[PDB]
RNA sequence: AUCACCGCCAAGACGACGGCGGACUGAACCUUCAUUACCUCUGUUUG
């Protein structure tokens, strides 16, 4: 929360004797504190609210700073006087006086006169003191102007009797109870900020009769003129000032009051809602409507309706939206409640903990629905690539009947299967009848995964539904259509695949380490212990934490912190450095020692460390947490040492609560995720740029990296893996030909449903499998979930979840085992079209360890994924438009030509790093024109190399395909929300209401149209990609998706932002124009990477050199799939 | 559309023309992979 910068989270629970939700504050994740009590007594929160109160009487300098002496003295006088009051009030301790003064004067407390010419210097006094008067100066100065009097008024306002901004008391009660000050009033307002459980406050308390009276004169058009007049005045300044909604708010409020007076003869708004419809109910809703419009950060004025017609339409749509938001909320709670025990109104899922539980479940569902949409697309290409089979679902009874009846189709599918399964001797000798059973089963296993409306819960009912479908080896009946019985062989073949992959795991894990030279850089005892630990973590494991960062990023952070502290004279700060190695650049992995160290570290981190760290508590957790905080504080004080109050500065990490005693790392990492969600929203408020928001919110992620870096180092030392850290780059092997240990048995005991699920996973990309395990881990890590008080209920639940996890892990650890060192299991001939000369494609990618070899393998795996979906039909035209020419191949060769001498690219790369470090080490602020010219020249060669590699090895083509899939994937995710909100939650909601609120049911029902449901289907089944000729239009898709999500404005509005932000993350800059409610005129450019940012030429001027990430060829491709064009700035 | 969206604090008199909450709500963030990979390191307070 923001209020007074008070620390802690808010929780909503039941317990109140009224039987309703109440919001409390928790400081350690466990305790519960009442808002009025806390916000009236907490030192930090009090001081925060006091200074906020002072800031509205006398403003501090704008920061979006340096005050005048007049301004400074004014703030100081008021501060001192107010301090004296609250001190004597017994609200303020002497201990906290310094904090109060630091926060009264955040700009600093030591300045020389304004005409002095000193380092720290006041601004010249303004011509009028009113320059720094705030909105509340008038109200607080009614009983005089002196500091003593301003302070007295502020104190009364905050702690005794709340005033309006005009200086009048807000409340004049006649009862036994005195009216509160602002602090308590606002705190009570927070206390009752809880989810509505019913429809009471959604009824519209006015109609046509009220409209006739109220809109005799068009208030909306006149308010619109207020907005235009506000715009013009701000636009009249030489620097064009933009008007915010917060500045418009008072002008609209006055205009609306004058309107009420015109209608009623009075400005008194107080009305009687219970008495029935009224003009003042309508007015209250008009005020609320403009309150919403004025809360907008961007272009508030532009959104103002121009007309009574527009205003009433906005009010209607907003009302319709709020009803559907409330009905989705209710229907979701009910769905998660089920039967349980309790009284829908008292359900755990109304609470903050319960809503967090819902959120992580819902996200798992999205990922699940998403993974099996891709599976569907994969199975389509497997079975019916040319669409020989208006239901577009191959698993539907009508279509699956056609598949099995077609003998050639089934046979051709079995012959193509290698692209999905790899080499599968297990499936070779089923026979034609056996094959038909097998193709049928996988379609039914897909359907069993895909046709689930489910959620996560303590019973693991979801996995039970999965098991019910996937344990089947027979379907239907003999007397009726679709009788399929799997043959004993077909069954054994299904069960054998997962069995053999498991059996093979031990030796694969050994070979992985062996092939990365790990056994060459470790004693036999050390290597043996490492290998044993890795296999043990995969074979027998509890549900671990996915909260761990990626090792590379952890290592990057550790490297960055090490680098800074090692540059400081104060050696005490060197303590915050680890001996963890830097992250390797890809080229550095060519060095055996470097590979060995990184792979050993990577496998250790992901498996044995993750297993160990997840359940850790006490000193092993608290030690690294504290150290991470100490480090951030040390870093902050060093960087900003010159700035004010530097000796008391703490890292922003210090706001975060320490781990509780008995809390596991898994639990503390999950709590931290809550902080991140909150921090991103807060940052988006200060700046709406998603990437700048991420930078300002990154301190949380950097705390986790620092904390985990210290834990990882500690673990390495504690378990005797120090040797890994001691391997130095370029070191020659300890043993030239080491004797490896025996492979450990990795055999498992798998149920049929696991084997079935495992085979369906072969139609889902590995990344999406990984995402499923990551979310499963996140959901399992969640504290405060609904549980059972049924003793063995949790034992069965835990068995299902463990078996599910084993399927995912085995799939991931097996990776390319059935593909490696074998020919491409698909036709490469269609991909010749991507080259001008087909012979050139053949020479490069059609076979007749090294770095060129790894690159060819990467490309072929890329093409495989396109073939897996049968997507050459979708992007053949576009790809063939951007054919790779022989001159590009030749140019790339000569740039990389290493046979005679240092190749062009290697020379360029080394010159660039050489110069960068020379600048950043010897003089980070400066660079000579000649140094800068060679730097630019190096970048140019580097760019040319990147662009040619991107074309010759088809990087551009594969990135375009991936981008396309990601965009459509994001829209499919929205489609899942449509299906689920409308098909489940709203239906549930409508049934609770019954005949009481038919108006709400008609509004719920409005969520659906034929076109929206069609868009849901077309997205789900990639029907938008089903065009033999031409390129897909993603702009039109986004527009269809916007319309699909119209039932929920927050989603409809977010649809385009999702896609923009997705591209931005990659450095692609997309822009649309909105005309007639449709996105259009898509343009594409890129964000250049800025080298030598704050570095100046020795001769003067910015020394900045810019690097392009992407070729014009790729930008053109991206533009084409958005039916747009490239527009690079000049 | 491109930070929105939902909700809370009612009046003894002319206003809420002011204050707020929000893992609570979408959007983000985080993420198995010897991937394309490039931006010195590091970051208080305000906002």
Numbering used by the authors: 1 to 64, 74 to 398, 404 to 803, 811 to 869, 885 to 1166
Task: Give the original sentences from the paper that presented this experimental model.
Cas13a are single-molecule effectors of the Class II, Type VI family of CRISPR-Cas systems that are part of the bacterial and archaeal defense systems. Here we report the structural and functional characterization of a Cas13a enzyme from the photo-auxotrophic purple bacteria Rhodobacter capsulatus.
The RcCas13a-crRNA binary complex exhibits a markedly increased stability of about 10 °C. We determined the X-ray crystal structure of the binary complex by experimental phasing, using crystals of SeMet-labeled RcCas13a protein and refined the final coordinates against data collected on native RcCas13a-crRNA complex crystals to 2.1 Å resolution (for X-ray data processing, structure solution and refinement statistics see Table 1). The binary complex structure of RcCas13a shows the enzyme in a contracted, inactive conformation. RcCas13a recognizes its ~58 nt long crRNA predominantly via shape-recognition, but makes nucleobase-specific interactions with its stem-loop and 3′ flank of the crRNA. We tested all RcCas13a mutants for their pre-crRNA cleavage activity and could identify Arg 1085, Asn 1089 and His 1113 as key residues essential for pre-crRNA processing.
